[PDB]
């Protein structure tokens, strides 16, 4: 990609936001990997939408890229797991434990065992390290604080966290200039039909 092209993606992001195409904005952030939107990320974490959270993150980093990005996924999947226990859905809790959390075992044998054994407690708050986890809403918030730190310090995100600043509708302004450049080449200067092909007077 050129930085022209990169900059164009940002213009498009602004345009898409102004036209209120909400989901297209965040798909573009994700697929381009050019901008990580904290505000959006927080909103989704609070909402507990974990499948979308991991999908949005996946545009920026994978689980095993680095120790920061590892702890990020581990924290997300841990909260996922604890919520399952908290609603006493042990079928889901074990599914999470095997599919999502087993990857962290290879390098943490002991922690994975400890986490597994939480299934057999009446309440995981019987474990002293988790004795402080009081609310799903509050827990998400605490965890979110931790993720923000991890993301900002993660070297793969380091230049991606701040949107540029632009006058409103920069793309619409540029587009307008292209129309001005087309029509200033006219020797009969109605009118201009579309953007699909260059305008002429005729």
């Amino acid at each position: 990609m050129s930085s022209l092209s990169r900059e164009l993606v940002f213009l498009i992001l602004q345009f898409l936001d102004e036209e209120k195409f909400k989901e297209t904005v965040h798909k573009l952030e994700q697929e381009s990997g050019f901008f990580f939107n904290m505000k959006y990320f927080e909103e989704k974490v609070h909402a507990g939408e974990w499948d979308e959270v991991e999908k949005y993150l996946s545009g920026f980093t994978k689980v095993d890229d680095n120790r920061y990005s590892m702890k990020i996924f581990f924290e997300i999947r841990k909260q996922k797991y604890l919520e399952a226990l908290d609603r006493h859905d042990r079928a889901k809790a074990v599914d999470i434990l095997v599919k999502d959390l087993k990857v962290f075992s290879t390098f943490n044998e002991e922690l994975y065992k400890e986490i597994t054994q939480l299934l057999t407690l009446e309440n995981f708050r019987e474990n002293e390290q988790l004795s402080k986890y009081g609310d799903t809403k509050s827990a998400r918030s605490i965890m979110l604080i931790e993720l923000k730190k991890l993301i900002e310090a993660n070297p793969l995100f380091r230049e991606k966290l701040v949107f540029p600043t632009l006058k409103a509708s920069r793309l619409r302004t540029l587009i307008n200039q292209s129309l001005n450049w087309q029509h200033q080449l006219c020797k009969n200067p109605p009118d201009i039909k579309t953007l699909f092909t260059d305008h002429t007077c005729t």
Binding site: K71, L111, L130
Partner: peptide, 7 residues
């Protein structure tokens, strides 16, 4: 510091 744990 950065290593994984329960709480």
């Amino acid at each position: 510091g950065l290593e994984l744990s329960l709480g």
